Structures are given as structure tokens and as C-alpha cells.
Amino acid sequence: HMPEFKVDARGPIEIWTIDGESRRNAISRAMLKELGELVTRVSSSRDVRAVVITGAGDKAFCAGADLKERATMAEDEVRAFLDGLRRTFRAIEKSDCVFIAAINGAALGGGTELALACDLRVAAPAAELGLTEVKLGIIPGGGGTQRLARLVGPGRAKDLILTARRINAAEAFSVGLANRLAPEGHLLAVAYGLAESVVENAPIAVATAKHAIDEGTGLELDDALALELRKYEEILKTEDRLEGLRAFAEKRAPVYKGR
Amino acid sequence: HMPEFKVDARGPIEIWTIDGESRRNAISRAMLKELGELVTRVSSSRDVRAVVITGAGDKAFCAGADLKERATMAEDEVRAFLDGLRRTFRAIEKSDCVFIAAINGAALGGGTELALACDLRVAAPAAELGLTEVKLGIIPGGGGTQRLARLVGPGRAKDLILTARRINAAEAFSVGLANRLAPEGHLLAVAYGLAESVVENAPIAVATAKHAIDEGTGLELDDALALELRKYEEILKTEDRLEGLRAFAEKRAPVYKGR
Amino acid sequence: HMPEFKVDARGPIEIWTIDGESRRNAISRAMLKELGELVTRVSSSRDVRAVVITGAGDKAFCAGADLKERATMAEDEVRAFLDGLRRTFRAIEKSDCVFIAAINGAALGGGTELALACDLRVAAPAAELGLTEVKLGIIPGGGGTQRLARLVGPGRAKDLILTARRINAAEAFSVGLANRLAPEGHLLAVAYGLAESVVENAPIAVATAKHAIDEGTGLELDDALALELRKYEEILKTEDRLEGLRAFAEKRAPVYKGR
Known about the structure:
- The structure is a homotrimer.
- Chain A is α/β, with parallel strands linked by helices.
- Chain A has two domains: about 1-200, 2-enoyl-CoA Hydratase, Chain A, domain 1; about 200-259, Orthogonal Bundle (Lyase 2-enoyl-coa Hydratase, Chain  A, domain 2), CATH 1.10.12.10.
- Chain A contains ten helices and ten strands.
- In chain A, the strands form two sheets. In chain A, strands 1-2-3-5-7-10 form a six-stranded mixed β-sheet, with helices on both faces. In chain A, strands 4-6-8-9 form a four-stranded mixed β-sheet.
- In chain A, β1 and β2 form a beta hairpin.
- In chain A, α1 (about 30-45) packs parallel to α3.
- The radius of gyration of chain A is 19 Å and the shape is globular.
- Chains A and B meet through α3 and α5 of A and α5, α7, α8, α9 and α10 of B.
């Protein structure tokens, strides 16, 4: 039997491919379990500093919850699955590792909410994203309403969520939902280059800045500045910040150890 | 005597036209009274699920407070009028019905604040929006500073409000203030199509998502996610969400009842 | 000896040029001291209503902290310098005077954080902005993470800060980081025209609107609307708002006194 993810590990960067092309890379409980374990692994040390998540094929990044498996699941199993999915999105945000969603096709439902929980997004020409829950009488249940509004603002969020329309790669780039647009056939080359541009920077500094950004939202200005300054004073105590000064003084690339 | 609004009712969608072309569709107390009653009516059941608001003619969406009537109003009457105007904007936001502003011309003052209180905006080629209060020594008094900043961010809000410049349809679309741009002569066709794309979705789900978006702003991430989840668990108790599942299983359009 | 700033005073508008081309207009303690005194001066009356800040030459707006002087400064002197820099950014925000950054070249570090603390930004073709701290193992220490995220949102902020890439003038304009793009050779003409469009408006109204925008961020909607209304009721008590009504009634330009 084949694992839910193909892992292409390249030292400080890994590429995780959802190996589910025939089921539109949907989130089964087994897929979710592997995803959670991968996140826990890269979150437990500073060996891995950026992860690219993508789906197999050219049709689906991730269709969301697996509706075949849903036919085997009672109400309480559905609720426990959605709880685990929310916890996994939050683990991605709280992780010191940076997460890049390489959107190779359609994202819907939980698959869109996965892309929104990532730090950065790259869109192939076939990328599409949708939160279509209101068509079926519910709302996004894995943070999609809040995470979309925080990223594109309330007007664009209402547009997508209340009309339940899909957004294509060009519009996703124009509104900042996609940070990069990749040419035909170069999705993972672009996503990997993005990861390279992150992991040459210091891992605790990247992590701390990531968390400062996310944790400052919803605070008034002075509270948010106080939060940033606590994190600045924390990072000054690291050994890596000294290596940064030494590398700058010695006109060489820094070699950071994650301490 | 003719009413302040022409109402073009089409079942789940209504078009309300401010019938005031000769006075630039300004907000008199009588116009405001009708507006409040219309909002209360569509907010009291789920019969009406989207409303398009527009102004008569091709020059003004809504010029704001009626300055002819202002000459008849004492200070205390001005204050009571602005209080009612604020309450009406808030009623639009709190309503389960979705509100689309079809901007057929210039919006200023309270007319801009009306457009900002709506859920979505469509701009005709002649659409213009301005908050020019600082030219006259005051600031927007119907929520315009907050509602603009929440929609386009602090830099663009400062630009418009501190310079008191008007923004045209093309720029409004580029910065997301207008969700759609309509071709010459097709404003209400575009706005109505937008309304159709909303009202085929489930009304309590649309409403709940609208409120989740608006109520999450200003909260830190975990508080906002907790708020979304309370609303998700609420919507699971509706009958319409079951119709959504049944329609999906039966490969047919859903027929939602608002329960 | 020449002052750290050249001041081109034109009544209600001043242009402050960092006179440091040979050191990339870096922030020494002496530069920072002059900057703080200039801000205190224009913040202490309503004589000056807009200030344009720019750097000498065509290469650097402001490179940030002066690394030559840093070689003479002990750890405690660095900490006191960064504290003063933060206080000066906050003074710019709290000032009733409007601040326009005319970005003539590269901004980095504290120089970028200065531009972000300003109310509005104009970019010359050579404008570049960067927060590259993570390359050296730290994070921005003068509010840059919060001020950038508040202006361009969390996805674009993470992109710039986590990759430590520089953004050019065209992209800065598209994402709203630059409010205006100036043609080759016309930076200060464009920035001055922007200042003129501010200072013909009433100074207490401009100030109050500026503060309403900044102070409302991080509040939930009703708290933010209550804050705006307190400021509206404050501004109604000014003499200038009466001059605004009189000028409008008399079809003439207002002449505001700052009271």
C-alpha cells in the first residue's frame, strides 16, 4: 500500500505531494493523520525550515473532505474529523516551519482552508480556489471565513463566500491570495525557489517574524508593537543572531544552526 | 405624491431605486424613513434574500444628507437625523439579507457611507465615491472612516479621506471597493446577476457567513475562530442544511425554505 | 558643520531632506535627534499641516541605522537608540501634522520603518523598500512587522519579511504601499502636490480623521464606531468647522485657523 503523501526531502526544504490524483487529492482521515504527523515532525526541530505542499496531477490541489469516506462515518466521526482538521491548520500556523501551498489545480472546502492556513501560496495556471459551502446550506467549518477575510479583506471575502464562486489564478494573484504565479509546467520550480529564498534566512528569525505577523492581527497598535518588541528582545538572545552579525562582518553567507 | 423609493420586487430579489434624480438622490428624513422601513421589512423574514440599492439617473448614486432640508432643521434635528442614519447603516449590516450597492454615479458623504455599509458594490462607468468632509472642517459622521479603512486598509483610507479626493470606477475596482465593473448601460443587469448568484445559495448560510466575516474583524485569531465555530454549530441545526445534503445527493438544485 | 536635514519651509508645508547622500541617508543618533525635534516642532502648533520627508540623491531614501556609528556604540547605547527611534515613529503617528514619505531610492531597516510610520508614500522610479532583518538573524525592531502587515495584509507582509526580498516602485504602487508613483525627475513636485491637497483641508479635521483611522484598527466594529463618534462630536466643537460651513455658504475657499 502506498502512503497518502509522497515526501521529496531535500535537507532544509521538503516537498509533500498529496498522492491522491484519482480522488482529487481529498482529505480522508488517513491523509489527515499523515499530514498531522509530517507537521509535528518538521515542527519539532529546526532541520526543516520550509515545506511545499502540493497535489498530484493537474486537476486538483485538494478537493476537501473525502466524500467517499464520508459515507462510512457517523455524525460523531465527522465532528472528530473536523476537530482534527482545525487543529492541524492551527499547528501549521503555530509551527516555526514555513509552509508554501503550490496550487496545481482546484482547491475547495478543506483544501482551500489548508491553502489559507499556509504562510504563502503559488498558483499554476490551472489553480482555482473556492469556498462553496453556502451552496449546500452551511458555512466553511475549518476557519475559512476568518482566514480568507484576514488575507483579502471583508469585501472580497464576502464576494467569494456569499456568491460561492471560484477564483482563478490571475485574480488570485491580483488580490494577493497567490503570492507568485508560475508559468505552465513550472509550479514546483517556482515554489522551490520561493522556499530557497526563505531557508537561507535565519530559522528562528523567520519563525518569530511569521508569528509576530499572525499574532498582531486583532490588536490595537500599541499592544501589537509591545508584542513585536517582546519577540525582538527574545530573538536578540539567540546564537544565530550573532552568526548573522559575524557573517555580515566577514562578507560571507551565514550558516545558521537554529539556536 | 410619489414615494422616496421605487421598489422593483422580483421574489427573493428586490431593486430599490432612490427616486430623487433632481435632488441628486440626497438623504432627506423622509428618504431615510422609507429606507429604514424597507430594511426592517426584508430583515423580518427570509422571503427577500438580496437587495440592490441604486439611484435614479446617471449623475448621482446618492449625494448624502439633503442640504435643502438642512435649512429647515435645528441642531437637535440634525443630531437625531444622523443618529437614525447610523442606526440604519448598522441595520443593513446586521440584516440577514444581502445588500448590493449599484453605484450609477457620484456618491458623497452619507451616500458613500451607505455604499460602504452594503455587503457588495457594483460600479457603472460614471461611478465616483468621495468622503470630502475634511474640506468643510469635519470628519465623516456615519461610520465612513472605519468602514472605508476596514475595506481598503489604512493607507488608501487616509489617501481618500485626508486629501478629500474622489475615486473613479476603475480605481474603485482595482482597490476592491467595487466588486464588479459594469459596462455602459448594463449596471442593473450586472447587479441583478450578482444578486442571483447569492440568492440561489442557502439564506441562513449566506447570512451567517456575512455576519461571521463582519463580526470577526478586530478579534485575535483564536477568538475569531471560536466565533466562526459557534456559528458553524448553529447552522448545522438548520433544516436547510439537510436540504443541501439531499439536493447534492439527488443531483438537483436545492430549494431552501429559510429554516 | 551642516545640519542633518535640509528644511525647505513653505508655510503650511515643509520639505525635510535627509542631507546624507554619502552615507545613504542613514539614521545616526544626531540625525534621529534632529528628526525628533522637527516632529516636536510641527506637532506643537497648527502652523505646519503637511511635511514631506525625502533623502538626498537618487540611490537611498534611508538605509536605516548608521552602521559606521554602530561601531562606536555599546549594547546599552544601541538599545537607547532603538527606543528613541520607536518613540519618534510613534510621535509621527500621534502628530496632528500629516507626513508624506517621498521615496527617492532604497529604503531598508529603520528607513523602511520610517516610511511606514508616515501617513502617505510617494515612489520615484528608483524607489525600493525592504525589511531584510531575517537575513541577519533578527526581525524588524522599529515596528516594521506590524506596520507593514497593517498596510498590505499578512500574506504580502510574510512574503516581504520572510523572504527578505526588496519590492520595487511598480509593485509598491500596485499593493498600495505607495499611494502615488512619480515620473522620472518629478518626485518632489508630485509629493508637494499631494501635500497641497491635504493642507487646503481643515487641519483639526485632517488630524482627527488620521487618528480615527489609526486608532480604530484592532477594534471590533461597534467599539470602532463609538470611537469615531466621540471624535466627530469633538470636531463639531471647533471654530474651523463653522468656517467650513460659512465658506461653503459663501462659495469661497475656507481659511482655517486651527481652532
